[PDB]
Amino acid sequence: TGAFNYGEALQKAIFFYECQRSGKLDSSTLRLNWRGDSGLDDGKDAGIDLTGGWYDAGDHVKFNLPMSYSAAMLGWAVYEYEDAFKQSGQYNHILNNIKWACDYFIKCHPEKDVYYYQVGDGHADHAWWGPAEVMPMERPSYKVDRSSPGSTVVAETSAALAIASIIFKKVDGEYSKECLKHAKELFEFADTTKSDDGYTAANGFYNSWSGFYDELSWAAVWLYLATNDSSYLDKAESYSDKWGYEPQTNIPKYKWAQCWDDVTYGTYLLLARIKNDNGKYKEAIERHLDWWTTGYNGERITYTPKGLAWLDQWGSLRYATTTAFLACVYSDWENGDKEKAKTYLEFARSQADYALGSTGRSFVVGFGENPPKRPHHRTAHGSWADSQMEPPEHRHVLYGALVGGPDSTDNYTDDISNYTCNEVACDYNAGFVGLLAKMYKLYGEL
Amino acid sequence: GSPDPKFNGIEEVPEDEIFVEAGVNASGNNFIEIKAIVNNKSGWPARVCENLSFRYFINIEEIVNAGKSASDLQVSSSYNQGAKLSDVKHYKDNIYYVEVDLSGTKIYPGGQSAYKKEVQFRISAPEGTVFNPENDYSYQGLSAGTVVKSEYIPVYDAGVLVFGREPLEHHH
Ligand SMILES: [Ca+2]
Ligand SMILES: [Ca+2]
Ligand SMILES: [Cl-]
Ligand SMILES: [Cl-]
Ligand SMILES: [Cl-]
């Protein structure tokens, strides 16, 4: 074992983030030749430089909620499995990409209680089909402030920067400190406003559904891990009664996944390891991972016949691979339940292998047997004529992109206009990178 | 183990990204009129070009041998929005060219009207003077009523050759 080249998949899944770069690029060091300068006027309507960051998906909007969630999850992967990244030769690559997003979040925070959370108008952006470098339409910027706040996106950004402060401590101490300063200020802004009234330009794309208490606790626990100031630990725990319960109960919620909207599940796990007191956070993460694997109290997530744990029709692979990363991290917790860890790790392997080819085909662009070749992605496609069908084949290979995936009976079609199947996105790849790092550690290092 | 470190997305450029297609729009004893469509189908990477120009080369041997000169040629057009047309300019020997300059117009792979711009220009000699297109470098392979990509109508980006070749004999 293993059954697939996890090291190659990891390399490619990280490379995907280079394909998403907005802003001024250095063509002399890029690992590809089909991306150029784009979005260079981002921020100019506000009088501020907001260039850089990542385009969200196959479009060119910069949506800071999924963008910061994705940078946090990549950062969490490096925090847990640094050696796996070094041994696979991917350590500088992953840091370079995480810094691309975090440099942008810093630009987006020009004063203590002001945060720009989006560049681009979703409707206008999606109305045109061509490569990033030649976008013809205006790209407005949007901000939240004390009068019109955005606790969800400000706290997820705080969390990404807090994580960045940890993983950059040794390689770039000055940047590490800069990220931490911004992370503390952003957290205070989100925590003292507790409101999303100002977060409006992402309506219909990235609404805050679960609310901001999960993000407040996620950012606080990462700030605790970044500073060792126990006041942040207290702060994270203080919202445990606010994250959410299963309907009609007082049981901490468990029937969903760690995702751009809901970071409750990873928070359970991080707090369980910190407290190590056989208490409620242990119980909560185990309920969650049991439901995804063997079942909890007679209930279990839907599985496809070919073995995919299937949460929803949108980003099915995204949800399964992200949960598989949490399962990896659980499996490495010394004080965890050893029999559950075995079950969780076998689940993580099965979901990685489904994404990489266990059904007979790969769901990762540019990887493995019969991969998707028509991901829904404007720049990789490379239309010169504002049309998804011209040319009929993509001009470029979007290596590493994890696509949406199949329906609940394993049906999938490789078609540029099939959204459930062929969507790609920052958040689709983020947990997947961590899963691949652990699989490479387990199977690819000797 | 570890993945192949040679991995990259530096792709083969499979097609000419920026070029002119041209054809004969009209002709007579003493003139030729060219339809030219400048294309920017860039992909490696896509880019906006706002300083493109091209040059159409003629040979005036037959004009000179008739006792006339380049100053007897006239460049005209009723179809050139966004394009400036030069008078005939000397290259070398009896080779001259018309420069067509689209600087200030954005041409980019972003829609049917964006990736290609059409220009029409006519070069005339006086009535009764033979104008022979057959010995003109940029006339090679052109037809009436159609446009085709031509390596003999070179394209420039801020005056720097990016596609096609100038008429170098016999000298390269
Ligand atoms: Ca939330
Ligand atoms: Ca001639
Ligand atoms: Cl490791
Ligand atoms: Cl919302
Ligand atoms: Cl590499």
Residue numbers in the entry:
A (entry chain A): 1 to 446
B (entry chain B): 447 to 618
Question: What sentences appear in the manuscript?
Answer:
Cellulase 9I (Cel9I), is a non-cellulosomal family 9 processive endoglucanase from Clostridium thermocellum, which degrades crystalline cellulose (Avicel and filter paper) as well as phosphoric acid-swollen cellulose (PASC) and carboxymethyl cellulose (CMC). This enzyme consists of a catalytic GH9 module at its N terminus, followed by two family 3 carbohydrate-binding modules (CBMs): CBM3c and CBM3b. The C-terminal CBM3b module, as a classic CBM3, is responsible for targeting the Cel9I enzyme to the planar surface of the crystalline cellulose substrate. Thus, Gilad et al., showed in 2003 that the endoglucanase activity of Cel9I is dependent upon the presence of the CBM3c module and suggested that the fused CBM3c serves an important accessory role for the catalytic domain by altering its character to facilitate processive cleavage of recalcitrant cellulose substrates.
The effect of the re-association of the CBM3c with linker (CBM3cL) and the CBM3c without linker (CBM3cNL) on the enzymatic activity of GH9 has been studied by the crystallization and structure determination of the reassembled GH9-CBM3cL complex at a resolution of 1.68 Å. Surprisingly, the combined modules crystallized and formed a structure similar to those of the known GH9 cellulases. The catalytic module of the Cel9I enzyme consists of residues 1–446, comprising 15 α-helices, whereby the twelve longest ones form the (α/α)6-barrel. One calcium ion is found near the catalytic cleft of the GH9 module of Cel9I and is coordinated by a Ser 210 (OG) 2.6 Å, Gly 211 (O) 2.4 Å, Asp 261 (O) 2.4 Å, Asp 214 bifurcated (OD1, OD2) 2.5 Å, and Glu 215 bifurcated (OD1, OD2) 2.5 Å. The CBM3c module consists of 150 amino acids arranged in an eight β-stranded sandwich motif homologous to other known family 3 CBM structures. One calcium ion was found in the upper β-sheet of the CBM3c molecule and is coordinated by a water molecule and five residues from the upper β-sheet: Asn 500 (O), Glu 503 bifurcated (OE1, OE2), Asn 573 (O), Asn 576 (OD1), Asp 577 (OD1). The in vitro reassembled GH9-CBM3cL complex has a large intermodular interface, the contact area of which is 1,108.3 Å2, corresponding to 12.3% of the total surface-exposed area of the CBM3c module and 6.2% of the exposed GH9 module. Conserved residues of the linker (which spans from Gly447 to Asp462) make numerous contacts with conserved residues of the GH9 module, emphasizing the importance of the linker in this interaction.
